[PDB]
């Protein structure tokens, strides 16, 4: 069972993989001494993935609140 922790971890891992590729590309096209950790990392992929995680996912389901037992189930 991929508990929710592992699901979100896989998604943020994919996002950080895109971040890694982006920062490597930036490194290949950046000069030295003008490089700071603040500027090089693009936060777009991680947020875009953890936000698209909920969307288009067969696992992020609309909660059903018909009654507390529907919730637990």
């Amino acid at each position: 069972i991929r508990n929710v922790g592992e699901l979100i971890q896989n998604q943020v891992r994919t996002g950080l993989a895109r971040m890694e590729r982006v920062v490597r590309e930036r490194m290949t096209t950046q000069d030295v001494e003008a490089i700071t950790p603040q500027t090089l990392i693009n936060i777009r992929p991680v947020v875009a993935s953890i936000k698209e995680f909920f969307g288009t996912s067969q696992l992020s389901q609309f909660m059903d609140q018909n009654n507390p037992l529907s919730g637990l189930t």
Binding site: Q38, T39, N42, I43, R44
Partner: protein, 301 residues
Amino acid sequence: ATADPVKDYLKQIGKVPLLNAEQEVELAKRIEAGLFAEDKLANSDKLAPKLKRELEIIAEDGRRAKNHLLEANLRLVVSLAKRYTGRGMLFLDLIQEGNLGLIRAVEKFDYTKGYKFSTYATWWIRQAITRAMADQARTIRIPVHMVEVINKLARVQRQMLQDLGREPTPEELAKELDMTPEKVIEVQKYGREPISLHTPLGEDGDSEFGDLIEDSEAVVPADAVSFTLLQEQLHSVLDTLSEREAGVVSMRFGLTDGQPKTLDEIGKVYGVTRERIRQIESKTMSKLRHPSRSQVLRDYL
């Protein structure tokens, strides 16, 4: 000839001789030699046949060296196509557009610049690629200068999010862009992309979005039939009026033809003066305003 045609394109590049400094400077030398050869051939003054053939041969050799240069730079252009892949344009299409930029650049390159061809070309390659992306990427075409406006505001807004760590307020963005907020909202709304109808609704796998949104061009049967009943009732009401009165009001309001005629405009076929016809128009409007011929038409609005 295989799936993923870009692989076959890369193989079609194959192995071609990369050019070191002396090689491409000599290639450019005989390129311009062929250039003057074809220039001399283009002139109308008579030249000896053998000399003309020699000039044509030199121009042909220049052409061959041109294609040598293009095949050598195919690798650079595909690299620069990578550099802008994944923005709504297919990778091979970006490669081809960059190749168009490349043929432009070689058509505008010579050794007179004390630099390698690689440094000079990349500007034109990026130019052609970005022009193509601006003019052919989005479903609803956006002008190039709107394109740079939207990409500028997008990238600077990304910088604002990166710095402040929070969604910037529209006024702060407006002042940073130096434009007013209304332009900010305008370009923000213009910088969208369509959503495809043929997508699963997601409520059910079978259902698709294009089968859930209603049209406006449909003639609602209730409205059409109500309009027809209004037409019949109104025409009957005018038939209640005198023949001349009903006719003149009809032309004044064009029940017979989609264009109503001005009062003077009615006073040509009927043979009445603009003030006379006006007086009867006033008379018709009064008569249809009595409560007799008003109960029926009140409800139809």
